Amino acid sequence: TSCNPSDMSHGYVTVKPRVRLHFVELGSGPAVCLCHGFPESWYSWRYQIPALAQAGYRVLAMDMKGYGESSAPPEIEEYCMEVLCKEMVTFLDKLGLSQAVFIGHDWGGMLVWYMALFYPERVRAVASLNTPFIPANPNMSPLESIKANPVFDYQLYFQEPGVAEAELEQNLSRTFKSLFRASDESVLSMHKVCEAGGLFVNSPEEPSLSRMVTEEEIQFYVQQFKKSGFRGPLNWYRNMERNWKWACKSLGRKILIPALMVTAEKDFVLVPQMSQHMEDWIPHLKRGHIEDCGHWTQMDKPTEVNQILIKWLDSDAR
């Protein structure tokens, strides 16, 4: 079971005069906020939305700041974790929600950890797909940390505004077809990007459609990204100095609320090994692991994600 955009309830919350956030809503019961990653949409949760609502939950699948129908200001400062988390709290206030279960993937996963860290009174429970929780080191710089591991090469390529924007916007159909693939079907070399010139360097001009996605699904991402482009989505990566300084202010405090860390076996960037020793800083931490699952966790193994999320929600969040 998937989602048809015309058959969904579309909600709009003005968090700031310049910032309006779009979301889809399905089901009744406890509020469950779904936060997608880069370069995604609310549509990335298409298989989770009817499954979680059927399970007995009020699903609020977000269109993150800079994505789809949500506002996309050009400023880099507008995409730091501090302002992004603040808006999500304002989103809960304007909807009359005291608490909500926050589930995130990729960049959304990073947001949900900081939402649980800085606002535990507004987050009932926290779940993250692929993205682990690493407390910021005050004696270590955020720039040299990305330079240390060769897999985060594309991150430095994403820093300069306009450089990644022109490549990703060049051909939207080619962009999502090359990105949304299973690990065995993938051709993207994340280890070396800056030297290669771009991300779709080894990718063909007309790539084949992956087994996880259809032509209709790919074209929805194409139409959504025509509204604002890639500037807003890429700006999430351009706040390494601001995010590090804000995270160092928490230092000592822990995420005491019920947590769930879901690792993807085939994610070569957000490797399952990165999630090690997370229970030292998170006492009520639960785990989930998906075999043959790449980076696009929701699209790759929807049945496995639905099973783990529902089981954890009914036992630890309810």
Ligand X SMILES: CCNC(=O)Nc1cccc2ccccc12
Query: Could you give the CA distance from residue 207 to residue 13 in angstroms, rounded to a whole number?
Result: 38
Query: Which of 15, 81, 23 is CA-nearest to residue 236?
Result: 81
Q: How many helices (H) and strands (E) does the chain have?
A: 12, 8
Would you say 1 or 149 has its CB closer to ligand X? 149
Between residue 168 and residue 197, which ones bind ligand X under the rule CB under 6 A?
Answer: 179, 190
For residue 151, the 8-state DSSP code is: G
Q: Which one-letter amino acid corresponds to residue 62?
A: M
- Beta-sheet strands, E only, within 139-246: none
- Quick check: 63 and 37 in contact, CB under 8 A? no
Beta carbon nearer to its own copies, 58 or 181: 58
Q: Which residue reads 């790759």 in tokens?
A: 300
Q: Which helix (H) or strand (E) holds 220?
A: helix 215-224
Residue 53 as a binder of its own copies (CB under 8 A): the answer is: yes
Cα–Cα distance list, 259 to 33, 129, 148, 256 (Å):
14, 11, 28, 8
Find the binding residues for ligand X in span 112-141 (CB under 6 A): 131
- CB under 5 to 8 A by kind: which of ligand X, its own copies, none does 53 bind? its own copies
Instruction: Write out the E strands in 169-316.
Output: 259-264, 285-290
Q: Which is nearer to its own copies, 71 or 155 (CB)?
A: 71
Of these partners, ligand X, its own copies, none, which one is at the site of residue 229 (CB under 5 to 8 Å by kind)? Answer: none
By beta-carbon proximity to its own copies, the closer residue of 9 and 139 is 9
Query: What minimum distance in Å lies between the beta carbon of 106 and ligand X?
Result: 5
The residues annotated with a catalytic role in the active site are 106, 237, 295
Q: Binders of ligand X among 26-55, rule CB under 6 A? A: 38
State yes or no: residue 110 binds ligand X (CB under 6 A).
yes
154 is in an annotated binding site: yes
State the binding partner of 59 from ligand X, its own copies, none, CB within 5 to 8 A by kind. its own copies
1 contributes a contact to its own copies by CB under 8 A: no
Interface residues with ligand X (CB under 6 A)? 38, 106-107, 110, 131, 179, 190, 269-270, 295
